[PDB]
Write a protein that binds this ligand. Structure first.
Ligand SMILES: Nc1ncnc2c1ncn2[C@@H]1O[C@H](COP(=O)(O)OP(=O)(O)OP(=O)(O)O)[C@@H](O)[C@H]1O
Ligand SMILES: Nc1ncnc2c1ncn2[C@@H]1O[C@H](COP(=O)(O)OP(=O)(O)OP(=O)(O)O)[C@@H](O)[C@H]1O
Ligand SMILES: [Ca+2]
Ligand SMILES: [Ca+2]
Lengths: 342, 166, 169, 399, 274, 134, 208
């Protein structure tokens, strides 16, 4: 509904701060531009120039107000605001291929970087040598990691890779956190332990997402399918094949309602029926260049702006068209009298 | 009567195949290569498909995570058509740098080949690129018939001008 | 480049920042009496045809400002002399032109106010006024014997050209 | 070299010089224009070129070349059609061809040319020589030059814009080239005005024709304007010439007096400001500027060999006047230094073949055995493609 | 230009300027020129012994003896008379013009000089047009190798004279494009019922390799009689170069077409940009 | 020493993890039950066999049924299939395109049009995405 | 030694390539071993010089003395190391993916393609620039094979790169693929199955 163009080229990735008062985007560059809203206008306030290759992921730790980025230059940088300038701190990831994605753990004590080195770098800060160090989750990743998403417990981590699998690992780092409480996903969670692995053997997994309480993980694959597995039904997996193009990003908006977007260029709704254990198409959310959708190219990222993944009231999409859209769930519900969430 | 259906199948197949995204090389440090060309990571290559009008006219579409190769087998009803097509395709390939989505050489067994990468689908509406390939297929068929007539039309005036001077 | 006066003496006088150069003349004015066989007016007429085509002129000294002024004035004489029809008639319009009050440095209408200094007071104003008229009168006289053969087309051909694209009018 | 001499073709913005290798002058010098009707049948063939294409009642005149570079390939390709089958009368498959190009010509334009020569005309071999290198080869004919060399500064002034091109060991230092917004046309345009403000009886539709005639028949470069202006006023009878022309309509004669414009015309090379508001730098300074921009180690070799090329450099004493003015600039500059270095020898070569220096240099090289070896052949074109015409190995000096 | 011109512009103009100057009274300029013509012809214009008052025009044809075996010398002497002198070493026919003794009307000789090559070809055709007009059948045919690997055959019959050309098509494709032009000559009578008949084969020679084409021109008395004889000779001896010339101009035309279609394609692709 | 493609033996490389009843299909096909032929001919596809022959056999059986149909009866048949069926038909329609003979591509282009309408471009996508296909 | 100290090490083979020369400095226990330290006559300028010659065959006539600093710019921005030359020559020859625009100081634009990887290929094939030798990769192989059998595996697992001429995208991968090749031939004498166990990764840290 509410569309804004920051540029005509792709917005590789984005991240909002705690207040959603500012958004950082990568304008298909080596840099990150931060925009702040003033009235009904967007004003550029910062420029993070440090990566020596295209930025692929961006995540903003809310409380600590720390932005983390990763790029094809094989590096990752943690940005801290010192007065009126963001300063970067290099992080050695020990990878020999491009970084692809990165997400701060909910507890902000560590972040995870997925890379083409066929591994996930778990990074945390050691305040005894003043530097970020990392541990690698290797097995059984056989290809590049496209996306990551932490479980609300800051320990389990969902990951999608080009080996067609959606997995859940333990990213438990004893030096910064306490041993995790049990979860339906399993009781044993030593670092790198594989908690779950999808069975399908086709389609790159572009996006992965945990539900608000974390008992459900959903991912979208290139073979135009969406999936959801919940630890409460013994990890049963519901699967839905679409009639349209591949989805590239997905997020829960309630415990049983997903919103995704991809190469069709518009957001759609998916709902899950716990009893039946089946997923169902909920409809196109952007109903009316040469296209009848807000975005004029592939939507590659979506994120909740408010209400959390438990009762989302507004979400955001950024795409290869350079646009950023803000969707209001409540409005979408009025505009579409036959829409059904949860 | 068989063209419209043929181009509709080819169109749907391109739309499905032209779903690309930037992919840094997982094989070579800090490289970025069209995967359908280097084919060094089998899991990144999609299944090759074909759409044939008949035993002669057909299109081969090869997709991967960041690139798509498209090869067209043009209609050539006779010798003069064959050499005309070969000259035009050669004419365009020599100019492949201005035709940024054209391949300098076609895949063995085809007359002309395209290589559409994620960079193309980034700065050009993919539905517009799909349109172009379909437009291209039709238009080259027409231009070839216009060339064929020209040669014949001019051949006649040339034979008459000479003969009528005796 | 263009042709610059070489009459600047270590002891030459100044009326504004123009050089009060001697001239062998009979008309009244503050110009010093000239002994040598050539003055700033012969130098101006000799350099005219060439200099007139130039657009950029570098003022080397105050003698050049006096030279520039005369070159601009010659163009004025040709405009008039052109429509004349006898060396005697030309001599008439030459007196009449020499008398008219053309604008001077610092006034609205003078072509090079950024280069020529303005009279500092009422006396400089009167002296300068008189020195310019003296130059004009003598210029128009010596120039009148050149231009006439019948005003030679070899002088008339310049009526349209302007030194540095300027005009005393 | 076999039985037949190669064809040599030098296409310029205004004139095209064509002929056979070995000869001293071109067999045809024609305006680089083509007249067409303004396409079914053979209408692509209804056209004329050269002078026969300038005043054709029912044909639109066109110029395929701007700033020495082909702007219309269709029209250019047809121009070559008549160059070969009508004027040269050569079976294109039996003769190697040598074509010329301006320094700013792209390798892309070179492939377009090769495609036309090989695809359309089936030539057995093609070589695309750089115009500046040919000018330097042609200067070898000069007395002033003792040993053959391809290191030098070339002043090419034809009809469009003039170019100060530095060349080292056969290859142009493209990044150090400079152009001068003054050329043949500018000089005629200036002489034309000098004629309007003075002479009468000149047929309005023949103004440019008369100015151009006077430019090539009575103009020259003088050492000093006032002295020169004075020689004319002091003697008129010995400096004022007479040009009579033919009234194209009245078919009658009209005569005018030719005066000052004789030396004022070429002067704009040294005092551009006389006619061009946007440019003031004298040619001698641009030459100095170009050479000072080149590598230190090659500046003296450049100063020692300033070769001329083009019709616009044909004015008497042009070289003398350029050498004098350039010697002063370098002498003064070298003086200040001493105040705050072995003298620099400035030498400007002039020869008989200047009007067609490029063509001549080309004719001489295309008559040698080496030319045939460095020429890209038809077999090479077929097997490797038109890209083999991107680089044309220089030859003629080393041996 | 559809028909190929028959006269040599280099020859004509070299001569015209020389006569214009000789006639004006100027001192003669030296002249030295080498140039060619279709069919491996090489010309030479120069001042023998450096005597600038004398200008010589020589032509060299590798197949001259064959033309000479069919009346070439006799015919050439008729046309040039005294301008024709002993051949310059390396050439077969030499014309010589004394600048200090030219005729009142020059163009007549300037024009004839320009047709030197054509006049060397002339006699072979006049010889057989002659046979046919005297019903002298059974005569041996003339074989002229106008190119290293192309041949012309002339044979006279009771009511027609035949000229068969054995031309080569270098490119494998050029044969096809050539079939198109010949097909049209083949049916030309459907446009000029009185014009000559044209037969064509692709490898097989008539009764009279992949790239050889035999063209046969049947000439009738209305084409070989004394009145149409010259125009007919001007056309038939240029035929081969007329065919190859047009095949190339055809390719040039197709280029302009291809430049147009490609340019159009490039316009659409770019309209696809945001 | 550069001729050996060392990457071949790299232990970081990726490595991936029968047919219809001829008579059964001819039974429905012979008894006019076209829609039943389709569904039967798409039963148990050769997706796990390394033999290209057992696959082409299944292709022939399906292709036979596809040609047997009548232009006006295709839409009805297509609609009877469940999404997975439509997916499978697509793979077959595409496999057929690889063997043009006797105007078979003419009928395969008509079937494609109906399968596409039934499964959407997504059915095509799943043809490109398969790691083991017909 | 100083280079190795930066990455917290004491033993290892360092490959430093700058503007003038390339060295292969093995270090053991914190001190260099000059008896193995070999030298490679090709480096930075050589590659820049080679780029100039490659750009000449393409129709761009740059002057070695006048435009050297300009080509260096081009080299540093567009050149890289091929991983598999055959594969690279196919991309250059059959497509335009490698083609990149480059603006010269005067405004003129040039296209650079295959010469982007062909120029740095000198480091591996010296003969391309008329220089006898083995090539940085192979040189590396010998320096470590002609050393202590016990400290050979340690060296192979600690090769570090330094110098501006080691920044070519792909260089680390090319060395690895080249060492495995030499290791599969000149060691495992042919049996591929024992190749897997051969551990080798080249440290290409972010700075220096
Ligand atoms: N004798 C002469 N004196 C002065 N100028 C002459 C003389 N003869 C010819 N020109 C001038 O030379 C110019 C043509 O020279 P030239 O043929 O070298 O230029 P071009 O190659 O056709 O064009 P360009 O070199 O600018 O691309 C015309 O302006 C012509 O008037
Ligand atoms: N990104 C790059 N890719 C390839 N080469 C580069 C890059 N950046 C710089 N170079 C080259 O590296 C060389 C400079 O490296 P460096 O500064 O290490 O040399 P140096 O230490 O001054 O001299 P040396 O190491 O030879 O003794 C130059 O050739 C420069 O062009
Ligand atoms: Ca020129
Ligand atoms: Ca160093």
């Amino acid at each position: 509904m509410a569309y804004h163009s920051f540029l005509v080229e792709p917005i590789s990735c984005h991240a909002w701060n705690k207040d959603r008062t500012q958004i950082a985007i990568c304008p298909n560059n080596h840099e990150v531009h931060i925009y702040e809203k003033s009235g009904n206008k967007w004003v550029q306030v910062h420029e993070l120039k440090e990566h020596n290759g295209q930025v692929t992921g961006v995540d903003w730790a809310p409380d600590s107000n720390r932005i983390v980025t990763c790029g094809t230059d094989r590096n990752a940088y943690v940005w801290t605001l010192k007065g009126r300038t963001w300063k970067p701190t290099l992080v050695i990831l020990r990878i020999n291929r491009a970084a692809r994605c990165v997400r701060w753990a909910p507890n902000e004590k560590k972040f995870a970087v997925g890379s083409g080195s066929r591994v996930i770098s778990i990074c945390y800060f050691e305040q005894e040598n003043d530097w970020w160090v990392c541990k690698h989750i290797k097995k059984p990743i056989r290809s590049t990691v496209l996306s990551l998403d932490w479980h609300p417990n800051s320990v389990l981590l969902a990951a999608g890779s080009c080996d067609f699998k959606c997995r859940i690992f333990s990213a438990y780092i004893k030096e910064v956190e306490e041993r995790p409480a049990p979860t339906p996903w399993g009781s044993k969670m030593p670092f790198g332990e594989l908690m779950f692995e999808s069975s399908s053997s086709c389609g790159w997994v572009h996006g992965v997402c945990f539900s608000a309480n974390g008992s459900r993980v959903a991912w979208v694959s290139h073979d135009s399918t969406v999936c959801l597995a919940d630890a409460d039904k013994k990890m049963a997996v519901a699967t839905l094949a679409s009639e349209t193009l591949p989805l590239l990003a997905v997020t829960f908006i309630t415990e049983s309602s997903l919103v995704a977007a991809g190469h069709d260029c518009f957001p759609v709704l998916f709902t899950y029926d716990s009893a039946a254990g089946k997923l169902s198409f909920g409809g196109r959310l952007d109903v009316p260049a040469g296209l009848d959708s807000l975005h004029k190219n592939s939507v590659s990222q979506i994120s909740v702006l408010s209400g959390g993944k438990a009762k989302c009231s507004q979400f955001c999409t950024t795409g290869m068209d350079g646009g950023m859209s803000i969707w209001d769930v409540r409005s979408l519900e009025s505009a579409l009298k036959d829409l059904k969430i949860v | 009567a068989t063209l419209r259906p043929y181009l509709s199948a080819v169109r749907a197949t391109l739309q499905a195949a032209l779903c690309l995204e930037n992919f840094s090389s997982q094989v070579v440090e800090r490289h970025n290569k069209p995967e359908v060309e280097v084919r060094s990571s089998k899991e990144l290559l999609l299944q090759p498909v074909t759409i044939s009008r008949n035993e002669k006219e057909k299109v081969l579409i090869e997709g991967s995570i960041n690139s798509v190769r498209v090869s067209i087998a043009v209609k050539q009803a006779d010798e003069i058509e064959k050499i005309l097509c070969h000259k035009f395709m050669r004419f365009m390939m020599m100019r492949a740098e201005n035709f940024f989505i054209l391949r300098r050489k076609p895949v063995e067994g085809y007359d002309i080949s395209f290589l559409i990468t994620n960079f193309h689908t980034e700065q050009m509406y993919k539905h517009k690129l799909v349109d172009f390939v379909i437009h291209f297929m039709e238009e080259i068929d027409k231009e070839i018939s216009e060339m064929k007539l020209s040669v014949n039309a001019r051949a006649r005036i040339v034979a008459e001008e000479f003969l009528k001077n005796f | 480049p263009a042709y610059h006066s070489s009459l600047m003496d270590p002891d030459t006088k100044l009326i504004g920042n123009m050089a009060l150069l001697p001239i062998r003349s009979q008309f009244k004015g503050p110009a010093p009496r000239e002994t040598k066989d050539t003055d700033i007016v012969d130098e101006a007429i000799y350099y005219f045809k060439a200099n007139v085509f130039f657009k950029n002129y570098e003022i080397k000294n105050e003698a050049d400002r006096t030279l520039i002024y005369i070159t601009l004035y010659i163009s004025e004489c040709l405009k008039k002399l052109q429509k004349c029809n006898s060396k005697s008639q030309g001599e008439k319009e030459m007196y009449t032109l020499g008398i008219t009050n053309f604008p001077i440095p610092g006034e609205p209408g003078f072509p090079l106010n950024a280069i020529y200094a303005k009279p500092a007071n009422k006396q400089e104003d009167e002296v300068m006024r008189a020195y310019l008229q003296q130059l004009r009168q003598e210029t128009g006289l010596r120039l009148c014997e050149k231009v006439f053969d019948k005003p030679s087309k070899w002088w008339t051909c310049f009526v349209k050209r302007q030194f540095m694209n300027k005009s005393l009018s | 070299a076999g039985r037949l001499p190669a064809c040599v073709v030098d296409c310029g913005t205004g004139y095209t010089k064509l002929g056979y290798a070995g000869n001293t002058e071109p067999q045809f010098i024609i305006p680089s224009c083509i007249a067409i009707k303004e396409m079914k049948g053979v209408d692509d063939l209804d056209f004329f070129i050269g002078d026969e294409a300038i005043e054709k009642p029912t044909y639109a005149t066109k110029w395929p070349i701007r700033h020495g570079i082909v702007e219309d390939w269709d029209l250019m390709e047809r121009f070559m059609e008549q160059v070969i089958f009508k004027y040269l009368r050569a079976e294109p498959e039996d003769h190697y061809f040598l074509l010329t190009e301006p320094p700013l010509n792209t390798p892309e334009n070179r492939e377009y040319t090769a495609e036309i020569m090989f695809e359309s005309f089936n030539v057995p071999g093609l070589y695309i020589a750089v115009q500046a290198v040919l000018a330097l080869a042609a200067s070898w004919t000069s007395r002033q030059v003792g040993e053959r060399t391809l290191t030098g500064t070339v002043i090419d002034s034809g009809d469009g814009v003039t170019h100060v091109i530095p060349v080292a060991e056969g290859y142009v230092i493209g990044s150090c080239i400079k152009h001068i917004p003054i050329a043949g046309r500018d000089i005629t345009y200036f002489i034309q005005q000098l004629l309007r403000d003075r002479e009468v009886g000149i047929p309005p539709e023949q103004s440019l024709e008369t100015a151009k005639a006077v430019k090539e028949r009575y103009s020259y470069v003088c050492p000093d304007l006032v002295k020169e202006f004075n020689k004319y006023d002091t003697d008129g009878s010995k400096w004022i010439k007479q040009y009579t022309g033919i009234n194209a309509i009245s078919k009658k004669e009209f005569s005018i007096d030719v005066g000052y414009e004789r030396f004022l015309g070429p002067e704009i090379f040294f005092h551009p400001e006389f006619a061009n508001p946007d440019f003031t730098q004298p040619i001698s300074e641009v030459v100095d500027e170009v050479i000072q921009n080149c590598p230190i180690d090659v500046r003296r070799p450049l100063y020692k060999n300033i070769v001329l090329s083009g019709g616009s450099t044909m004015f008497r004493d042009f070289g003398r006047r350029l050498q004098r003015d350039l010697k002063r600039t370098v002498d003064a500059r070298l003086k200040l230094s001493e105040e705050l270095p072995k003298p620099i020898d400035v030498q400007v070569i002039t020869h008989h073949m200047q009007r067609y220096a490029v063509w001549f240099g080309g004719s001489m090289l295309a008559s040698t055995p080496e030319f045939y070896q460095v020429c890209h052949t038809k077999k090479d074109y077929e097997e490797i493609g038109p890209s083999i015409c991107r680089h044309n190995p220089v030859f003629g000096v080393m041996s | 230009m559809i028909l190929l011109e028959v006269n040599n512009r280099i020859i004509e103009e070299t001569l015209a300027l020389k006569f214009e100057n000789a006639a004006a009274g100027n001192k003669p300029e030296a002249v030295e020129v080498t140039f060619a013509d279709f069919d491996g012809v090489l010309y030479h214009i120069s001042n023998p012994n450096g005597d600038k008052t004398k200008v010589m025009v020589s032509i060299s044809l590798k197949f001259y003896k064959e033309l000479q075996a069919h009346g070439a010398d006799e015919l050439l002497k008729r046309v040039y008379g005294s301008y024709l002198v002993n051949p310059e070493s390396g050439y077969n026919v030499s014309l010589l013009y004394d600048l200090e003794n030219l005729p009142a009307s020059k163009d007549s000789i300037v024009h004839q000089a320009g047709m030197l090559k054509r006049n060397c070809f002339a006699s072979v055709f006049e010889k057989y047009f002659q046979f046919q007009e005297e019903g002298k059948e059974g005569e041996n045919r003339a074989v002229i190798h106008y190119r290293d690997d192309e041949t012309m055959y002339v044979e006279s019959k009771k009511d027609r004279v035949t000229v068969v050309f054995s031309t080569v098509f270098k490119d494998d494709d050029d044969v096809v494009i050539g079939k198109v032009f010949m097909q049209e000559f083949k049916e030309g009578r459907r446009a000029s019922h009185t014009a000559p008949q044209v037969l064509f084969s692709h490898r097989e020679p008539p009764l009279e390799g992949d790239n050889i084409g035999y063209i046969t021109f049947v000439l009738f008395p209305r084409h070989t009689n004394a009145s149409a004889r010259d125009n007919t000779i001007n056309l038939i001896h240029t035929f081969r170069d007329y065919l190859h010339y047009h095949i190339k101009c055809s390719k040039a035309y197709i280029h302009t077409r291809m430049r147009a279609k490609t340019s159009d394609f490039l316009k659409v692709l770019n309209r696809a940009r945001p | 020493f550069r001729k050996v493609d060392v990457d071949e033996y790299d232990e970081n490389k990726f490595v991936d993890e029968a047919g219809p009843d001829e008579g059964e299909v001819d039974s429905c096909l012979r008894q006019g039950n076209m829609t039943a032929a389709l569904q039967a001919a798409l039963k148990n596809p050769p997706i796990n066999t390394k033999s290209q022959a057992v696959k082409d056999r299944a292709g022939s059986i399906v292709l036979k049924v596809l040609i047997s149909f009548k232009a006006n009866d295709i839409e009805k048949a297509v609609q009877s299939l469940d999404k997975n069926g439509v997916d499978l038909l697509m793979k077959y329609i595409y496999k057929g395109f690889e063997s043009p003979s006797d105007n078979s591509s003419a009928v395969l282009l008509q079937w494609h049009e109906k399968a596409l309408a039934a499964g959407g471009v997504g059915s095509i996508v799943r043809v490109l995405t398969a790691r083991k296909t017909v | 030694v100083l280079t190795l100290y930066a990455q917290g090490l004491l033993t290892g083979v360092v490959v430093d390539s700058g503007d003038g020369v390339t060295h292969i400095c093995p270090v053991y226990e914190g001190f260099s071993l000059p008896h193995l330290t070999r030298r490679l006559d090709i480096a930075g300028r050589d590659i820049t010089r080679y780029l100039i010659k490659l750009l000449l065959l393409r129709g761009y006539a740059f002057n070695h003395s006048a435009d050297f600093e300009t080509v260096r710019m081009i080299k540093e921005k567009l050149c890289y190391v091929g991983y598999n030359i055959e594969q690279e020559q196919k991309l250059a020859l059959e497509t335009t993916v490698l083609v990149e625009s480059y603006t010269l100081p005067d405004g003129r634009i040039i296209k650079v393609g295959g010469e982007r990887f062909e120029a740095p290929e000198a480091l591996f094939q010296p003969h391309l620039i008329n220089v006898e030798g083995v090539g940085v990769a192979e040189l590396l192989f010998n320096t470590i094979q002609a050393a202590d059998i016990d400290t050979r595996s340690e060296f192979y697992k600690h090769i570090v790169l330094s110098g501006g001429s080691t920044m070519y995208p792909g260089l680390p991968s090319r060395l690895e693929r080249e060492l495995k090749q030499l290791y599969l031939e000149r060691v495992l004498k042919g049996d591929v199955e024992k190749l897997s166990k051969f551990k080798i990764r080249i440290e290409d840290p972010p700075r220096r």
